[PDB]
């Protein structure tokens, strides 16, 4: 389940918080940033309460300060069965959808409906199957013996059950699941009988089982529109769904909640790099947040006073002031030496790399000096240099060798700036020849 090699945020299992929403210094893979974690815990409580809608928050700070780490912590603390959509700023610039339509689809993907239904099921291990044919074979008679670990029974079959058993061959000793009302029979496997391999089911054979469904508003939006089927949820060409089906879906969902047949589960939409949206997207986002079925929007940006896209002026955070008026802003700060070394030790534990104390100190020094991501990339590349000399622990010499082999930002700018005759400039001039 959920195959993954190692992620860059794989150590974050949530927000480290107490029962009084106080952040521990080291919990759940998150260290430091006490005020930002407290604010994100308040936002998490806002989402889990579910009584308010359409509030936008902004996580702003310098680069490499843990904004995406905060978003991943909120997403892991939400758990399953709550919608979480994560998009980038450049994702909505489509050739087949308008920008407002893509933003609308991303908005309605983040709110879901919890529907609870029950179905009656058959589960057991097949003992013996008899199919009988007549002289002409016009009618078919049958008997099926099926057992669990507690009972055993024999059923008399009709024509459509016999046809459904002949199709998708079922032999003796197979564990199968039968849905009577739909006629779908699945082979769970084979029982443990030497004389795939699953165990024989226990308890009753006729079980009424309850399955809790959660379906987003965008799925019912696609299915209710007749212009395409449910295969557009996978192929991805929905093609500018009309508004009137969305008002029908809104009214139907409202009366479903009134009757008690459904519950509304709002979620979080996360927009990473929100400064790359046009001003039309910002103006749509301003008026899309006052709807009753609107999620809580999280935006993350790292710019200063920069040019807003599609305009000719400059704005704080790259966003216009009317969008910033409806936002509450969480500010992240830079890290210390101890926080950097704790981050590097946690990244060592997740990458299964054993480090010396001196190697950790050198990594902390070069991480304070250059970048946190540079040391977090150097630590995994030092282990291969250590393993080429056939030893397990990563020492100082491996870190110095990796620091010599792989450059960083400021050093690369420094070697470029006194060798610029060999590189292609903004004017397209270069010197390739060695002499003259």
């Amino acid at each position: 389940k959920s195959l993954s090699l190692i992620a860059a945020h794989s150590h974050i299992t949530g927000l480290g918080l107490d029962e009084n929403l106080q952040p521990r210094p080291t919990s759940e893979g998150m260290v430091g940033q006490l005020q930002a974690r407290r604010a994100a815990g308040v936002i998490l409580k806002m989402v889990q309460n579910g009584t308010i809608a359409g509030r936008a928050v902004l996580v702003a700070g310098p680069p490499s300060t843990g904004k995406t780490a905060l978003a991943m912590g909120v997403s892991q603390s939400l758990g399953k069965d709550v919608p979480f959509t994560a998009i980038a700023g450049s994702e909505i610039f489509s050739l087949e959808l308008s920008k407002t339509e893509a933003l609308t689809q991303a908005f309605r993907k983040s709110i879901g409906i919890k529907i609870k239904e029950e179905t009656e099921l058959i589960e057991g291990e097949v003992v013996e199957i008899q199919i009988d044919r007549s002289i002409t074979g016009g009618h078919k008679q049958g008997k099926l013996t099926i057992k669990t670990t507690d009972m055993e029974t024999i059923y008399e079959l009709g024509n459509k059950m016999i046809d459904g058993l002949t199709k998708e061959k079922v032999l003796a000793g197979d564990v199968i699941s039968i849905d009577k009302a739909s006629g779908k029979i699945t082979k769970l496997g084979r029982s443990f009988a030497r004389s795939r391999f699953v165990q024989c089911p226990e308890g009753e054979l006729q079980k009424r089982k309850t399955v809790v469904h959660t379906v987003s508003l965008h799925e019912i939006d696609v299915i209710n529109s007749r212009t395409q089927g449910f295969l557009a949820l996978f192929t991805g060409d929905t093609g500018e769904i009309r508004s009137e089906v969305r008002d029908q879906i809104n009214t139907k969902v409202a009366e479903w909640k009134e009757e008690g047949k459904a519950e509304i589960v709002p979620g979080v939409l996360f927009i990473d790099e929100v400064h790359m949206l046009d001003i039309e997207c910002f103006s749509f986002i301003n008026r899309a947040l006052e709807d009753e079925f609107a999620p809580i929007v999280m935006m993350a940006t790292n710019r200063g006073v920069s040019k807003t896209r599609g305009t000719n002026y400059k704005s704080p955070h790259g966003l216009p002031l009317d969008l910033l008026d409806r936002s509450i802003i969480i500010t992240t700060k830079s890290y210390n030496e101890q926080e950097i070394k704790t981050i590097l030790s946690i990244r060592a534990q997740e990458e299964e790399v054993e480090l010396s104390s001196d190697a950790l100190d050198l990594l902390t020094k070069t991480g304070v000096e250059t970048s946190l991501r540079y040391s977090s990339n150097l630590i995994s590349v030092a282990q291969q240099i250590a393993m080429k000399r056939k030893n397990n622990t990563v020492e100082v010499e491996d870190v110095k060798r990796a620091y010599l082999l792989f450059l960083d930002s400021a050093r690369s700018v420094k070697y470029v700036q006194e060798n610029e005759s060999q590189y292609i400039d903004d004017q397209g001039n270069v010197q390739i020849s060695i002499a003259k």
């Binding site: 409580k45 920008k99 295969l231 500018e240 709807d291 704080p316 002031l321």
Partner: protein
């Protein structure tokens, strides 16, 4: 249970029978003149005599333009069509922007049809076709818990019955007017014919076979336009898997529109349909190109144009698509002649305090008096929307300390945790690299 999103304390304009507005009634505080002008416009819409009337309401940000348009929509009632819109939605990659404007115009004119639902439901007891090979009629006997009833049927409904594979003992649903046939399932009394079968068993209906009900259908002109202009062809009732070719939005010819108008007028003359004109509302009108602004001039001169309401917060701003045209509110001078402008005023301290108290009441929160004074001072110092957004984290921080009433300390912690635009810009200015 109950959700709240930036509104829903606004219930109406809050006017008396003379058209004058009270101070605090209907969820509105302040702004008497804009509310009275909007009530006059609501009366004009209810008169149902004029077409192509354009109103612009202008003012600063967070002054109450969208609340006024929502109050118009609540005062008109659910019967009148109301089509809210943002100006950025008129740009699409499928059709031109003028065609999208035409569709949004025609979405605001509605119709009311009075129809009757007639339903036969029960267990099939007799199914006897007969030849007149072509069958002339089939006789179906239906049974419920309150008796049985037999029906003659046309052969088309027998064809639809043969589509659904209906045998003796199935519970079916027949609609008399449309002719739709739905098979609910085999009846519960025939459930022990086999020990195991692929058929679902449903009980008998406990009511009568015959059911009669009067209903009202509300459609718009755009529904008839898109129903009469399917390019691929008429879709069936049920298509779980998609159409083989993707149907794309097209440029609907005005000949189709005049045919739809002719048919609708013919049905109106017979007393079947009722014409309900409505309101088209375009928020952030400064985000329109000049070509849409030119097309609005001819679109307002049609005989079936609705009442159009526009909003803007800009000042003397260059019109989009132009480079040397400076016009008030971002609206070009050719179009600005055709409207009537309703001015909207900023608020005072006491109005801000009353708005904050009303928002705390609708969100089911209790606040202290000193917390209310601090929130009012914060609202006058930063913005009105900041205190309204900061009201709910104050309630959460009061909840985590096992209390039910917000005090000054929770407001101080919420002010510490979350910033406004001014303090964020102050941090942005005095920073080394990118905040």
């Amino acid at each position: 249970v109950t959700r709240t999103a930036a509104h829903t304390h606004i219930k109406g304009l809050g006017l008396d029978e003379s058209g004058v507005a009270k101070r605090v009634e209907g969820g509105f505080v302040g702004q008497i003149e804009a509310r009275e002008a909007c009530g006059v416009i609501v009366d004009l819409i209810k008169a149902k005599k004029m077409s192509g009337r354009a109103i612009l309401l202008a003012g600063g940000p967070s002054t109450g333009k969208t609340a006024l348009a929502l109050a118009i929509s609540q005062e008109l009632g659910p019967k009148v069509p109301f089509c809210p819109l943002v100006g950025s939605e008129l740009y699409s990659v499928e059709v031109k922007k003028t065609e999208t404007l035409m569709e949004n115009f025609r979405r605001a004119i509605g119709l009311r049809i009075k129809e009757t639902k007639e339903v036969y439901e029960g267990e099939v007891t007799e199914l006897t076709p007969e030849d007149a090979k072509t069958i002339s009629h089939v006789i179906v006997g239906l049974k419920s818990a309150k008796g049985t009833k037999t029906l003659r049927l046309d052969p088309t409904i027998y064809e639809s019955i043969q589509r659904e594979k209906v045998s003796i003992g199935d519970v079916i649903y027949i609609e008399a007017n449309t002719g739709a046939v739905k098979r609910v399932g085999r009846s519960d009394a025939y459930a022990t014919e086999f020990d195991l079968e692929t058929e679902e068993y449903v009980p008998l209906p406990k009511g009568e076979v015959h059911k009669k009900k009067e209903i009202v259908q509300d459609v718009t002109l755009h529904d008839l336009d898109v129903a009469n202009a399917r390019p691929q062809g008429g879709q069936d009732v049920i298509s779980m898997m998609g159409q083989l070719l993707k149907p794309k939005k097209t440029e609907i010819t005005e000949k189709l529109r005049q045919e739809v108008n002719k048919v609708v007028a013919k049905y109106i003359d017979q007393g079947v349909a009722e014409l309900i004109p409505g309101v088209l509302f375009i928020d952030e009108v400064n985000m329109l190109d000049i070509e849409i602004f030119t097309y609005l001039n001819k679109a307002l001169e049609s005989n079936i144009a609705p009442v159009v309401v526009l909003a803007s917060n800009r000042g003397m701003t260059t019109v989009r698509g132009t480079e040397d045209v400076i016009s008030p509110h971002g609206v070009p001078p050719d179009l600005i002649d055709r409207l009537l402008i309703v001015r909207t005023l900023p608020y005072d301290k006491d109005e801000i305090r009353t708005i904050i108290e009303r928002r705390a009441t609708v969100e089911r929160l209790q606040v202290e008096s000193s917390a209310l004074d601090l929130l009012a001072t914060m609202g006058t110092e930063t913005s009105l929307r900041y205190a309204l957004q900061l009201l709910a984290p104050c309630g959460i921080l009061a909840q985590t300390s096992n209390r039910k009433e917000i005090v000054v300390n929770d407001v101080n912690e919420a002010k510490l945790l979350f910033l406004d635009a001014k303090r964020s810009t102050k941090i942005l200015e005095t920073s080394a690299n990118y905040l």
